Design a protein around this ligand. Structure first.
Ligand SMILES: Nc1ncnc2c1ncn2[C@@H]1O[C@H](COP(=O)(O)OP(=O)(O)OP(=O)(O)O)[C@@H](O)[C@H]1O
Ligand SMILES: [Mg+2]
Length: 1143
């Protein structure tokens, strides 16, 4: 429609149909629009009564919603309907091919209908021309469309012809379904059951188990109610239950029918009342199951008259035998199920603890299926599910572009992974896909589970009782197989990476020398049982995973591989006496593997289980790139009194693995000049860089930042990071915001690239709004730039996810670190790309700050009991960092950067001070006063255990930005302050002021002093650091009150105003945090003069139109406001920031 707003403009109207003409009327357009709206409203009512009548008189039209009926009306008249429509029609017939549908549409029409609509199409134009105005012609078109619709649309079936085609398909694939009710339930009324939330789904599996050897139900005959279940499919279930036309007797269940909304339940019960008044069958097996702890909701409190005192309950191995009997795919079908437990079509691969066998079990079955069915083209779809509240629309959207194509229908394995963070959607999804066999978009396509694929679901472990219903694989750790139940996979056993450590630790366990052994690449006679037990001896863990034994074996593989490719084996061959060396190599790499491959409130207890810090021994021996040398660090070698050489840690007499090497080997390493027993703190910078780049394998070093200190701890951290993604272990690091993790990783990347300006480190700031799509896209584009950097410069690339813990998509990061996968597709091993993840520690605020935050203004809106933002029982408001739970298999991989030390804290504060407010003209003495004052503020705030950021150097860089603003304006602010103090005070407050010292007092007032509540303590702590005029708390206090009075006097004058300290503070902070674009958050009681400060600031902060000379030198402010309701969408906040950017 087009509507002309002109005087005598009118309405133009165009149905997109070839037998209708364009309608056009002129006149006053408001009455035309009113008449047109009334007419289309009446037509909407008529259409709703017509479609209700057509659904009442055609049964099988009730399987489908309105949009699904539109899709099938569009598609069945087409000569080759889409496979989505045939999936949708395989619930009426089953195995519905295109020829059955040709027969069903051809056996549907009669010729009387044809020439009746031909008479209508030849009668209609004379009937339109008899109506003069557009209302009359339109009324004729709408009435003829109601009664005779297929004439207007000669390419879609109307609901009559569609309903007859569906009822004709239903008769072709016969053998209907006959189900009896269980005893206790009557077969002519509702049957209410109240049974408790963990019993609704197995009790339903009793009601259908009373007729075994009958196929399992589907989206008809069972509706799983949910909140945000619409009224349409509830009514469609009631239509399918309370109408005649069916061929068998079926049950019709509303499961969880108290989960429905109030409106949906009210509409559902009055629609049930309407369908039981008008016309129905008196055989309706309507069974309703509600949560018995939720009887107050509208469906059980309404239908409590038809309440059954008994709850049907079948035993567990009966339901297991029932579902396994229906999952038993027969032979000669060419299924993917053949390689599961002799054709079982549905699995659950589960475990108790992570990192054991689950994805390896699925990939093992996949190679088994490729080997049995003689093709390498069998697809394995991996559907990663990571969001909490499992969305079936995601699984459905991953299934539709796969398998509606009819291409490799006979084998497909689907690998549906539920991660550990999917806490609130699981049994409904598994009940629909694995038992009810479908997934549905109610305005779209309907998926059915094909008996002929293999849907393997991988779930970690109220839910354990449900998961026992299915044919379940339980994977075990290597300790729990060798006693209860070969455990080691035969492909991994004959792998090279499990074979060098096994063929070395086998010769090492019985004390054989290793003088003339170079592994001879190819599998030894070992068994995987003895391979497993030789790895279980030397790992040090008492109950390891398989991730941990793989990490142990890969570390020893990389170290012994570098040991075989050095000069020392051949030098012991030539010189004939260096023997005993490889025993030393094996013993020391067991020490290093103890460091790397191993670890080891009630809710923060598994995550704050950092039993070790960086303040622990780190004895490292590396072999260099392909050099003739070694690299010893983190330990010294001292001679024991019993004839051997022991390894101790530096600056401490504490032995670490006594008797690693004898005097003969130690003297032989003296004679070969290896760098053993060398201090790394009393050396200059070039020699430290030489030792790093000899250990890191960098030829021709170039120092990227000579200010970054190479203390021996940073040496050990760089060698730890480089070793972990040298051997293949994931790198995830738990540090705070203050530790130099990103600076160390930037130093490592810039040291390794040397001089090329190619982008090597890409830092990704993970935050709470980081969706999985961002992580997936960033990892695959970083992999593209990784391939480009390795092709051009032969250079490795690092992708650093900083604070990769604060999103609920942290499972995605586990996917990229542990099992090397981006949303299903594999990462490339020859790419050259190393993902580092960093995470925040999991500590809780002090109870003083928790009771302070709860009492800030009003309360919180949502209390700490009803808060859905939680880790365990702890709300995230009370945690110091807003972190979510680490996925297991990443807990045994995190390790600790050290926290910070004051020598390399004050030096970084001095670098920030000399960088941003640089000493071009301040002083050197004044910059060390600034640096000492900021250091005193940071060490003040650390001497109370309650700060949310764990205040860092970013706050210090912000605070010298505040200082730089005040110093660039301490030419007119001090003049205007002198005017104000001469007008309104005595001669005491009239001295001349130092614009560097004054601006430091003001930066302290804005940054640190305003936020605190114990301000006198902070002023006395910081007054021990200033020079002469501000040595007291009184001096800093009255100085900042003079300037708060100054900014409030420069505002337009107010009377009858609460001119207290709170208004002065709010106006002062608001002016300055607007000028510097620091975000400010004011919270108080609802009469606290913080709205008054907003009006005063916006009034005073005009650019040249301001009242005073002070605010005429500041900026001009335009405010855009947005009031946050509790039902506020995040699109409104984005809209307001874009509106400010437009201004
Ligand atoms: N039986 C085995 N023998 C040798 N190695 C194994 C075995 N099982 C697993 N692994 C190793 O464990 C590593 C991780 O195991 P996998 O990813 O299959 O466990 P998962 O159960 O999928 O872990 P998660 O619980 O995190 O999903 C794999 O790289 C594999 O090499
Ligand atoms: Mg897995």
């Amino acid at each position: 429609a087009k509507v002309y707003c002109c005087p005598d403009g009118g309405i133009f109207m165009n149905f997109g149909l070839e037998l209708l003409s364009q309608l056009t009327e002129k006149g006053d357009v408001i009455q035309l629009l009113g008449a047109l709206c009334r007419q289309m409203e009446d037509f909407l009512d008529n259409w709703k009564t017509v479609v209700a009548q057509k659904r009442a008189e055609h049964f099988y039209l009730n399987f489908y919603t309105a949009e699904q009926l539109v899709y099938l009306s569009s598609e069945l008249r087409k000569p080759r309907p889409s496979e989505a429509a045939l999936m949708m029609l395989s619930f009426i017939k089953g195995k519905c091919t295109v020829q059955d549908l040709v027969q069903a549409t051809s056996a549907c029409e009669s010729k009387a209908d044809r020439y009746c609509l031909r008479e209508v199409m030849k009668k209609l134009p004379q009937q339109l021309l008899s109506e003069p105005s557009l209302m009359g012609k339109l009324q004729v078109i709408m009435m003829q469309s109601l009664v005779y619709m297929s004439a207007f649309l000669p390419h879609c079936l109307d609901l009559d012809a569609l309903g007859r085609c569906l009822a004709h398909l239903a008769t072709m694939g016969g053998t209907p379904v006959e189900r009896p009710l269980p005893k206790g339930l009557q077969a002519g009324q509702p049957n209410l059951i109240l049974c408790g939330h963990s019993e609704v789904l197995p009790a339903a599996l009793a009601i259908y188990m009373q007729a075994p050897r009958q196929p399992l139900p589907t989206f008809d005959e069972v509706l799983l109610c949910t909140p945000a279940t619409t009224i349409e499919e509830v009514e469609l279930l009631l239509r399918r239950c309370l109408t005649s036309g069916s061929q068998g007797h079926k049950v019709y269940s509303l499961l969880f029918a108290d989960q429905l909304s109030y409106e949906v339940g009210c509409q559902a019960e009055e629609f049930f009342q309407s369908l039981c008044t008008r016309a129905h069958r008196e055989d309706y097996q309507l069974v309703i199951l509600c949560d018995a702890a939720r009887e107050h909701c509208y469906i059980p409190s309404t239908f409590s008259q038809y309440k059954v005192p008994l709850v049907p309950q079948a035993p567990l191995p009966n339901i297991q035998a029932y579902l396994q009997s229906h999952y038993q795919v027969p032979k000669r079908l060419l299924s993917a199920a053949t390689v599961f437990r002799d054709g079982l079509c549905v699995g659950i691969v589960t475990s108790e603890r992570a990192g054991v066998g689950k994805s390896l079990y699925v990939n093992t079955l996949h190679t088994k299926l490729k080997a049995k069915l003689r093709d390498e083209t069998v697809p394995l779809k991996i559907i990663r599910l990571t969001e909490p509240h499992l969305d079936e629309n995601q699984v459905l959207s991953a299934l539709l572009p796969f398998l509606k194509e009819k291409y490799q229908k006979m084998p497909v394995i689907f690998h549906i992974d539920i991660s550990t963070s999917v806490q609130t959607g699981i049994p409904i999804f598994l009940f629909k896909l694995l038992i009810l066999q479908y997934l549905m978009d109610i305005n779209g396509k309907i998926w059915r589970r094909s008996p002929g694929h293999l849907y393997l679901v991988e779930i970690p472990q109220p839910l354990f009782k449900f998961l026992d219903l299915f044919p379940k694989v339980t994977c075990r750790p290597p300790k729990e197989v060798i006693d209860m139940e070969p455990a080691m996979d035969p492909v991994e056993f004959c792998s090279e990476a499990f074979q060098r450590p096994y063929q070395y630790l086998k010769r090492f366990h019985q004390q054989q020398n290793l003088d003339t052994f170079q592994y001879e690449k190819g599998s030894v006679e070992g068994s995987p049982e003895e391979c497993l037990q030789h790895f279980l001896i030397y790992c040090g863990l008492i109950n390891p995973s398989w991730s941990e034994l793989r990490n142990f074996a890969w570390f020893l593989n990389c170290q012994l591989k570098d040991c075989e490719a050095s000069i020392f084996c051949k030098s012991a061959f030539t010189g004939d006496t260096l023997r005993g060396f490889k025993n030393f190599v094996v013993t020391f790499m067991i020490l290093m593997a103890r460091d790397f491959a191993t670890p080891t409130e009630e809710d923060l207890a598994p995550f704050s289980l950092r039993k070790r810090w960086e303040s622990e021994p780190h004895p490292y021996v590396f072999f260099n790139g392909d050099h003739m040398t070694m690299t010893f660090i983190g330990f010294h070698l001292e001679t024991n009194n019993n004839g051997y050489v022991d390894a101790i840690n530096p600056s401490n007499g504490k032995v670490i693995k006594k008797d690693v090497m004898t005097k003969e080997l130690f003297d032989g390493l003296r004679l070969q000049r290896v760098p053993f027993n060398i201090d790394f703190d009393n050396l200059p910078r070039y020699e430290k860089l030489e030792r790093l780049c000899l250990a890191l394998g960098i030829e021709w070093p170039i120092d990227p930042d000579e200010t970054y200190e190479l203390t021996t701890d940073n040496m050990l951290k760089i060698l730890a990071i480089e070793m972990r993604f040298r051997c293949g272990i994931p790198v995830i690091i738990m540090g705070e915001t203050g530790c130099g993790k990103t600076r160390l990783i930037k130093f490592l990347s810039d040291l390794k690239r040397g001089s090329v300006e190619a982008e090597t480190m890409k830092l990704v700031k993970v935050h709470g709004g980081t969706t999985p799509s961002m992580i997936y896209s960033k990892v695959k584009e970083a992999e593209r730039t990784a391939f480009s950097n390795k092709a051009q410069h032969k250079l490795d690339t690092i992708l650093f996810f900083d604070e990769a813990n604060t999103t609920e998509a942290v499972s995605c990061i586990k996917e990229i670190l542990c099992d090397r996968t981006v949303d299903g597709e594999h990462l490339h091993e020859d790419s050259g790309l190393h993902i580092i993840a960093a995470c925040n520690p999991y500590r809780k605020h002090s109870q003083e700050m928790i009771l302070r935050l709860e009492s800030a203004g009003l309360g919180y809106r949502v209390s700490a009991e009803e808060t859905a933002d939680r880790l365990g029982s702890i709300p995230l408001r009370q945690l110091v960092y807003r972190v979510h739970a680490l996925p297991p298999s990443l807990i045994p991989l995190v390790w600790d950067f050290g926290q910070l030390n004051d020598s390399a804290e004050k030096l970084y504060i001095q670098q920030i001070v000399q960088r941003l407010v640089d000493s071009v003209s301040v002083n050197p003495s004044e910059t060390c006063v600034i640096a000492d004052v900021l250091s005193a503020s940071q060490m003040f705030m650390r001497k109370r255990e309650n700060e949310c950021g764990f205040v860092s150097l970013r706050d210090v860089e912000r605070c010298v930005k505040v200082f730089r603003w005040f110093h660039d304006h301490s030419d007119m602010l001090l003049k205007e302050l002198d005017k104000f103090l001469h007008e309104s005070s005595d001669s005491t407050h009239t001295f001349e002021r130092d614009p560097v010292l004054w601006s430091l007092v003001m930066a302290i007032g804005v940054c640190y002093h305003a936020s605190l509540e114990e301000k006198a303590s902070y002023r006395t702590a910081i007054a021990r650091c200033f020079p002469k005029p501000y040595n007291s708390s009184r001096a800093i206090l009255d100085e900042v009150t003079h300037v708060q009075d100054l900014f409030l006097r420069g505002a337009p004058i107010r009377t009858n105003i609460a001119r207290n300290l709170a208004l002065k503070e709010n106006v002062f902070m608001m002016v300055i945090c607007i000028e510097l674009k620091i975000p400010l958050f004011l919270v108080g009681k609802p009469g606290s003069s913080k709205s008054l400060a907003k009006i005063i600031v916006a009034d005073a902060m005009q650019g040249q139109a301001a009242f005073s000379e002070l605010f005429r030198c500041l900026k001009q402010v335009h405010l855009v406001s947005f009031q946050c309701s509790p039902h506020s969408t995040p699109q409104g906040i984005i809209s307001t920031f874009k509106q400010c950017a437009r201004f």
